[PDB]
């Protein structure tokens, strides 16, 4: 009975970043910011 479950922290971080950028009425920065964050994950 091994039922896998994954630790989804990066997904939550991206969602929170999107929410924070939405609350500031700066959605045009979204694709600028989130992408950079993803690069920070890679290296």
């Amino acid at each position: 009975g091994i039922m896998p479950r994954k630790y989804l922290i990066e997904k939550h971080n991206i969602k929170v970043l999107k929410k924070k950028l939405s609350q500031a009425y700066s959605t045009q920065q979204l694709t600028k910011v989130v992408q950079e964050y993803k690069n920070l994950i890679q290296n």
Partner: protein
């Protein structure tokens, strides 16, 4: 006042006082001595000099004439409205002047790195679409001397910008395969760089001296080149009149004129110096 696109009243209003300033086929000798009313201004250049003397008081007729000037400018636009009433003529003549009304083709650019707007900061204001409409008495269309003093870059850039963005996509494909047609299109309409102009057309002008008073439509076209290469400034104007049959090459710099009234062989030009 101080526009391209009588004068004694305006000079006096500029500043109830007296002013005197000094400086044409015969020289124009544009000098203004205003006192208010003394309106000393040299004109009527042909020796037997003749001056248009008319004593007025600042319809009754020597003959006092009334000139009212309203001046208000908003941003780039500058509005000058002149109403002149002469007692002998008994008809009022209007005059309108508007500066830099030229339509805009540039666009605001959002910068994400600075997260700020960038307005069309190119605001050289060389564009000048002067419109001079004069109405005399019953004839409302007495004169329409609508001649733009813009560098013509405004108009050419607006035309090419309209063609490039809104017309190229709807052009059918089969016309593109025509040889040397794409090269013609590229030369006429080049690619944009930043928000600047596609073609750097500056200094030129197109002064249409049309007048509805003349029979039919007989406009006067005067292309003016204003560059600092020609003796450190001075307008070099080539004016072709459809009726007067005179091609005027005028070098004007602060009232100094070298005017050559050239007439085609009545091929073989005839020159009046």
């Amino acid at each position: 006042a101080s526009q391209e696109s009588w004068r004694s009243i305006g000079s006096a209003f500029g500043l109830s006082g007296a002013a005197a300033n000094g400086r044409t086929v015969d020289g124009q000798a544009d000098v203004g001595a205003s006192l208010k009313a003394i309106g000393v201004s040299a004109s009527n250049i042909t020796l037997i000099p003749s001056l248009k003397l008319t004593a007025a008081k600042q319809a009754v007729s020597q003959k006092p004439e009334l000139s009212a000037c309203w001046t208000g400018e908003a941003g780039a636009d500058r509005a000058t409205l002149l109403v002149n009433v002469d007692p002998v003529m008994r008809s009022v003549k209007l005059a309108a002047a508007v500066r830099t009304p030229g339509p805009e083709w540039r666009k605001v650019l959002y910068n994400d790195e600075t997260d700020l707007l960038e307005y069309p900061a190119d605001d050289g204001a060389r564009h000048t679409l002067y419109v001079q409409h004069e109405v005399r008495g019953r004839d409302l269309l007495h004169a329409t001397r609508l001649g733009c003093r813009l560098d013509l870059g405004r108009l050419v850039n607006y035309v090419v910008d309209f063609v490039d963005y809104r017309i190229e996509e709807n052009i059918p494909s089969f016309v593109w395969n025509v040889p040397l047609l794409p090269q013609l299109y590229s030369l006429l309409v080049p690619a944009d760089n930043d928000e600047q102009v596609r073609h750097r057309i500056t200094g030129w002008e197109l002064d249409v001296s049309h007048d509805f008073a003349r029979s039919g439509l007989l406009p006067v076209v005067a292309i003016s080149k204003t560059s600092k290469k020609l003796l450190g400034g001075g307008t070099l104007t080539a004016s072709y009149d459809a009726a007067a049959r005179e091609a005027g090459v005028s070098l004007s710099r602060k009232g100094v004129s070298v005017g050559a009234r050239v007439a085609r062989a009545e091929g073989r030009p005839s020159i009046h110096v």
